[PDB]
Amino acid sequence: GSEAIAKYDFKATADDELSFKRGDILKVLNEESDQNWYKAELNGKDGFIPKNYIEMKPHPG
Ligand SMILES: [Cl-]
Ligand SMILES: [Cl-]
């Protein structure tokens, strides 16, 4: 899994989507995907998140 920070509030509008707030750290499950939706987990929930809403955690420095 890879961490990513939410850059905007996102509200799920389908049952398979995962809501989150700006600042939340999501765990992205299939970062290697070339799709514009990722699968992620946050605070015990999971679902699809939009790729362009998040910033992947880089290596420090
Ligand atoms: Cl949700
Ligand atoms: Cl590190």
From Swiss-Prot:
| Quaternary structure and partners | Homodimer. Associates (via SH2 domain) with activated EGF and PDGF receptors (tyrosine phosphorylated). Interacts with PDGFRA (tyrosine phosphorylated); the interaction may be indirect. Also associates to other cellular Tyr-phosphorylated proteins such as SIT1, IRS1, IRS2, IRS4, SHC and LNK; probably via the concerted action of both its SH2 and SH3 domains. It also seems to interact with RAS in the signaling pathway leading to DNA synthesis. Interacts with SOS1. Forms a complex with MUC1 and SOS1, through interaction of the SH3 domains with SOS1 and the SH2 domain with phosphorylated MUC1.
Question: Which gene is the coding source of this polypeptide chain?
Answer: GRB2
Where found, per UniProt?
A: Nucleus; Cytoplasm; Endosome; Golgi apparatus
Q: How is it modified after translation?
A: Ubiquitinated by RNF173, leading to proteasomal degradation and inhibition of the RAF/MEK/ERK pathway.
Read off the domain note. Answer: The SH3 domains mediate interaction with RALGPS1 and SHB.
Question: What family does the entry list?
Answer: Belongs to the GRB2/sem-5/DRK family.
So which domain of life are we looking at?
A: Eukaryota
Q: What is the lineage of its organism?
A: Eukaryota, Metazoa, Chordata, Craniata, Vertebrata
Q: What does this protein do?
A: Non-enzymatic adapter protein that plays a pivotal role in precisely regulated signaling cascades from cell surface receptors to cellular responses, including signaling transduction and gene expression. Thus, participates in many biological processes including regulation of innate and adaptive immunity, autophagy, DNA repair or necroptosis. Controls signaling complexes at the T-cell antigen receptor to facilitate the activation, differentiation, and function of T-cells.
Protein name per Swiss-Prot or TrEMBL: Growth factor receptor-bound protein 2
- Looking at the record, the residues that make up the SH3 domain are 3-59
Modified positions (N6-acetyllysine) in chain numbering? K7, K51
So what does mutating P50L actually do? Ineffective in DNA synthesis. Abolishes interaction with SHB. Abolishes interaction with SOS1
Which residues of the parent protein does this chain contain?
2 to 59 of 217
